[PDB]
């Protein structure tokens, strides 16, 4: 019935779409796995929070502070979402 499985490529697609549809990004084709949120994507000290909340909403998760602050790279977010069995 619930025939659905997550994969790293799928997480990457959903996260890069999430970042593409965020207006406060610098602009597109800065968004890759190696991208940094502060330096490359040009995000403030609260747009990272908005991104982490959006990732929570997207993959059906709850990211505490000690695991939220240490997300500073897109690959880090992908690693994190793939390290949660309930990532939807």
């Amino acid at each position: 019935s619930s025939a659905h499985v997550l994969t790293k490529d799928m997480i990457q697609e959903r996260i890069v779409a999430l970042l593409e549809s965020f207006d406060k990004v610098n602009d597109a084709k800065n968004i890759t796995a190696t991208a940094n949120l502060t330096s490359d994507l040009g995000l403030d000290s609260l747009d990272v929070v908005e991104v982490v909340m959006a990732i929570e909403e997207e993959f059906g998760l709850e990211i505490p502070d000690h695991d939220a602050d240490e997300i500073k790279t897109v690959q880090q977010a992908i690693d994190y979402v793939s390290a949660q069995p309930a990532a939807v």
Binding site: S1, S2, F59, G60
Partner: protein, 246 residues
């Protein structure tokens, strides 16, 4: 007795419907703040749950009507003078059932999406073992009340032969004494309050999202089961454990 028999059918239908809804979400979530717009995705579940909710709201023709309106009328028809207040208490609980079923229906089916997108990609109706029960119980929750009316609520039925005292029998007075206002206010109230809750939630949703501290505190007491599980646990159970340690 009659309302017990009808409640069994349409409430079991409601819970079965809720189970199908819970299994339609990838993460099997039970919060109506995270369902959204599952009408076109779950139409059979929708018609079954709204059948059950209308046979719980006491709408005409269904089992809820025959099983529930007569009690609100017997509140007035009772020979005791003091039972008139119970009419209004029961009436308010009726116009509240309209609310807490229409809330379910809106937040689950009619509203805008609140989940992620993959949920709606994978939303699906469940298998035959779930749907066939819901079908049968919907047939029951449509017809069984009208079938069993003259058995249970009829004039002089004698089937369930409980020896009521003659001084206390108020059915003949209940069906006749009841005037138009006290007979129509429950039904009209239901059919109006339902429309109003849907319309407010769709067009004027700020009415339910004011963010007032004095409204929110009342919501919080009513959201914490009328602080009933905090009084029991603290002032009875915990003090009992403390006296037991003493």
């Amino acid at each position: 007795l009659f309302h017990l028999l009808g409640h069994a059918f349409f409430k079991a239908l409601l819970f079965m419907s809720a189970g199908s809804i819970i299994h339609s979400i990838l993460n099997e979530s039970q919060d109506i703040r995270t369902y959204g717009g599952l009408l076109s995705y779950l139409p059979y579940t929708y018609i079954c749950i709204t059948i059950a909710s209308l046979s719980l709201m006491a709408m005409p023709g269904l089992t809820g009507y025959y099983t529930k309106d007569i009690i609100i009328e017997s509140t007035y028809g009772s020979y005791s003078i003091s039972n008139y207040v119970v009419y209004w208490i029961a009436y308010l609980s009726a116009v509240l059932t309209c609310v807490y079923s229409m809330k379910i229906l809106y937040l689950t089916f009619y509203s805008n999406p609140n989940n992620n997108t993959i949920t709606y990609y994978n939303a699906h109706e469940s298998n035959i073992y779930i749907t066939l029960p819901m079908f049968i119980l919907a047939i029951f929750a449509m017809f069984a009340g009208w079938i069993l009316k003259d058995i249970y609520l009829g004039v002089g039925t004698d089937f369930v032969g409980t020896h009521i005292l003659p001084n206390n029998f108020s059915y003949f007075d209940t069906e006749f004494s009841i005037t138009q206002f006290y007979k129509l206010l429950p039904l009209i109230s239901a059919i109006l309050v339902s429309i109003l809750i849907v319309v407010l939630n769709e067009f004027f949703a700020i009415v339910f999202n004011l963010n007032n501290k004095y409204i929110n505190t009342v919501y919080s007491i009513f959201n914490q089961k009328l602080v009933s599980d905090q009084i029991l646990n603290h002032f009875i159970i915990f003090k009992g454990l403390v006296t037991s340690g003493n």
